[PDB]
Design an enzyme around this catalytic site. Structure first.
Site, PDB file in Angstrom:
ATOM      1  N   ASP A 139       0.817  -1.191   0.000  1.00 59.76           N
ATOM      2  CA  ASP A 139       0.000   0.000   0.000  1.00 59.76           C
ATOM      3  C   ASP A 139       0.870   1.268   0.000  1.00 59.76           C
ATOM      4  O   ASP A 139       0.423   2.323   0.442  1.00 59.76           O
ATOM      5  CB  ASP A 139      -0.994   0.033   1.147  1.00 59.76           C
ATOM      6  CG  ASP A 139      -2.110   1.030   0.966  1.00 59.76           C
ATOM      7  OD1 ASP A 139      -2.462   1.395  -0.171  1.00 59.76           O
ATOM      8  OD2 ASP A 139      -2.671   1.444   2.046  1.00 59.76           O
ATOM      9  N   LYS A 142       3.095   3.343  -5.604  1.00 54.90           N
ATOM     10  CA  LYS A 142       2.616   2.328  -6.545  1.00 54.90           C
ATOM     11  C   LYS A 142       3.728   1.803  -7.448  1.00 54.90           C
ATOM     12  O   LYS A 142       3.717   0.630  -7.828  1.00 54.90           O
ATOM     13  CB  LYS A 142       1.392   2.796  -7.319  1.00 54.90           C
ATOM     14  CG  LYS A 142       0.250   3.359  -6.416  1.00 54.90           C
ATOM     15  CD  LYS A 142      -0.050   2.490  -5.195  1.00 54.90           C
ATOM     16  CE  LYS A 142      -0.813   3.259  -4.131  1.00 54.90           C
ATOM     17  NZ  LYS A 142      -0.779   2.566  -2.789  1.00 54.90           N
ATOM     18  N   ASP A 167      -3.246  -3.122  -2.557  1.00 55.16           N
ATOM     19  CA  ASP A 167      -4.258  -2.082  -2.695  1.00 55.16           C
ATOM     20  C   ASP A 167      -4.031  -1.291  -3.989  1.00 55.16           C
ATOM     21  O   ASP A 167      -2.889  -1.207  -4.527  1.00 55.16           O
ATOM     22  CB  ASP A 167      -4.182  -1.079  -1.535  1.00 55.16           C
ATOM     23  CG  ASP A 167      -5.426  -0.188  -1.446  1.00 55.16           C
ATOM     24  OD1 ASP A 167      -6.507  -0.609  -1.924  1.00 55.16           O
ATOM     25  OD2 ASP A 167      -5.339   0.952  -0.857  1.00 55.16           O
ATOM     26  N   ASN A 168      -5.111  -0.688  -4.516  1.00 52.67           N
ATOM     27  CA  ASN A 168      -4.988   0.323  -5.549  1.00 52.67           C
ATOM     28  C   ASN A 168      -4.538  -0.193  -6.874  1.00 52.67           C
ATOM     29  O   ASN A 168      -3.878   0.557  -7.659  1.00 52.67           O
ATOM     30  CB  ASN A 168      -4.089   1.476  -5.115  1.00 52.67           C
ATOM     31  CG  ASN A 168      -4.523   2.106  -3.824  1.00 52.67           C
ATOM     32  OD1 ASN A 168      -3.737   2.090  -2.853  1.00 52.67           O
ATOM     33  ND2 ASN A 168      -5.753   2.636  -3.762  1.00 52.67           N
ATOM     34  N   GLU A 197     -11.460   4.247  -1.629  1.00 52.56           N
ATOM     35  CA  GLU A 197     -11.878   4.687  -0.316  1.00 52.56           C
ATOM     36  C   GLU A 197     -12.691   5.990  -0.452  1.00 52.56           C
ATOM     37  O   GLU A 197     -12.253   6.968  -1.075  1.00 52.56           O
ATOM     38  CB  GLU A 197     -10.681   4.870   0.583  1.00 52.56           C
ATOM     39  CG  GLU A 197      -9.514   5.716   0.027  1.00 52.56           C
ATOM     40  CD  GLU A 197      -8.381   4.899  -0.591  1.00 52.56           C
ATOM     41  OE1 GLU A 197      -8.633   3.854  -1.215  1.00 52.56           O
ATOM     42  OE2 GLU A 197      -7.211   5.335  -0.479  1.00 52.56           O
TER      43      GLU A 197
END
Ligand code: 75Z
Ligand code: CL
Ligand code: CL
Ligand code: MG
Length: 213
Positions: A139, A142, A167-168, A197
């Site tokens: 997280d 990136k 995540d993401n 989120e």
């Protein structure tokens, strides 16, 4: 003050000390009603919970603590004796994360390490007495998902069955990581579609289970 300080103060004033659920609810309320922040959030957080409960990991590594939301979310579901290590490059956020964990009563389960993942990962075995990791939550920046996955492998920190949860993978996205794990015989991948989120924007988590070299 900063947005991260405001989130911490809000928790301290709107949650119950020692009650992790209340801490999560306070953060999600603040970020919905007052100021958006890059916590994993409740939508993706429920997927994380389901994963954690399936695997009951004894040792979890998190790359990218931020304010400690995901650390609280994971650590509250760990079994007695199980541990979380979380790496955070920004010292201000590392301090907020430590205070968040202290408030939640989870400080004995979690070690928050202030530093860059690429510098700390090679120290985990000798300095932090890690053998192998049961789960890794990605997280952080990136751009670093793929190089840090490869580094974890090089350093002998992954074992057959280690669960990577990222995540993401849609927003902001991590296209090199995603292509790599989905193309590799060393990983078995599953995509969990969700939402960014606090937003009506599609995002998702990727689970990539390491299969050995
Ligand atoms: O950038 C993100 N997260 C990463 C923070 C970070 N930046 N620095 C670190 C670190 C922590 C240890 C490290 N070790 C080595 N590099 C490190 C970097 N962590 C992020 C961004 C968004 C986002 C979505 C939509 C938008 F319009 C704008 C933003 C959503 C999310 O859920 C995120 O997680
Ligand atoms: Cl988070
Ligand atoms: Cl949410
Ligand atoms: Mg994130």
């Amino acid at each position: 003050d900063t947005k991260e300080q405001r989130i911490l103060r809000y928790v301290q004033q709107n949650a119950k000390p020692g009650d992790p659920q209340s801490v999560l609810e306070a953060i999600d309320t603040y970020c919905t009603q007052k100021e958006w922040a890059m916590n994993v959030g409740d939508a993706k957080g429920q997927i994380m919970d389901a994963v954690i409960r399936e695997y009951s990991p004894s040792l979890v590594l998190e790359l990218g603590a931020y304010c400690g939301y995901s650390a609280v979310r994971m650590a509250r579901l760990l079994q007695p004796g199980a541990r979380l290590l979380t790496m955070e490059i920004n010292p201000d956020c590392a301090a907020i994360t430590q205070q968040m964990l202290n408030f939640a009563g989870l400080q004995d389960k979690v070690t928050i390490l202030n530093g860059a993942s690429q510098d700390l990962i090679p120290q985990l075995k000798k300095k932090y007495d890690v053998d192998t990791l049961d789960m890794v939550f990605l997280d952080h920046w990136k751009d670093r998902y793929l190089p840090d996955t490869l580094l974890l492998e090089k350093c002998g920190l992954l074992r057959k069955g280690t669960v990577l949860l990222a995540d993401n993978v849609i927003v902001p996205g991590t296209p090199d990581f995603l292509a790599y794990v989905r193309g590799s015989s060393s990983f078995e991948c599953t995509h969990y579609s969700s939402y960014l989120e606090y937003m009506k924007v599609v995002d998702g988590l990727e689970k990539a289970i390491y299969q050995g070299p």
